[PDB]
Write a protein that binds this DNA or RNA. Structure first.
Length: 164
RNA sequence: GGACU
């Protein structure tokens, strides 16, 4: 149970991911891909090569919740077939043309009320819920946060661990 | 910095 999760969380770097809509997170859950803006895309590629795992912790903006977490399985790829993202106003397809493959670790939600005790030393010790897209979460805070999520009754950590 | 609370 936790032994497999804790294994996957070991050596990890944790990034907060924000989405302006629910639909992109749902497409991401369904297809196992994500795109972020260029600045974070660069930070994520770099992180991928420095840690056994990079964990993306998803939160839809103004939702009052996290919607789950995933592990990067690839660096971003460009020049492939574009994802049908819902593009917030002023944002172009080109800005989210970097496509990362991800393997979901937990598709279950976690209301911010359940993480209120966790603060992030890498964001001025603000509660972990507060953070821009791509904000890195310190090791202890990130690990403990992921551990708060309800167990995902439908993901078998065999393949995820297999890949690593 | 063009998907913080």
């Amino acid at each position: 149970g936790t032994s497999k999760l804790k294994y996957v969380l070991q050596d990890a770097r944790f990034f907060l991911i924000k989405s302006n809509n629910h639909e992109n997170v749902s497409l991401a859950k369904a297809k196992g891909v994500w795109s972020t803006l260029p600045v974070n895309e660069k930070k994520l590629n770099l992180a991928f090569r420095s840690a056994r795992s990079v964990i993306l912790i998803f939160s839809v903006r103004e939702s009052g919740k996290f919607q789950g977490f995933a592990r990067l399985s690839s660096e971003s790829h460009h020049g492939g077939s574009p994802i049908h993202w819902v593009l917030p106003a002023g944002m172009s397809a080109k800005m989210l043309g970097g496509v990362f493959k991800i393997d979901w670790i937990c598709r279950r939600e976690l209301p911010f009320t359940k993480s209120a005790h966790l603060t992030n030393p890498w964001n001025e010790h603000k509660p972990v819920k507060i953070g821009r897209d791509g904000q890195e979460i310190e090791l202890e805070c990130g690990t403990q946060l992921c551990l708060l999520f309800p167990p995902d009754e439908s993901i078998d950590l065999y393949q995820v661990i297999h890949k690593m």
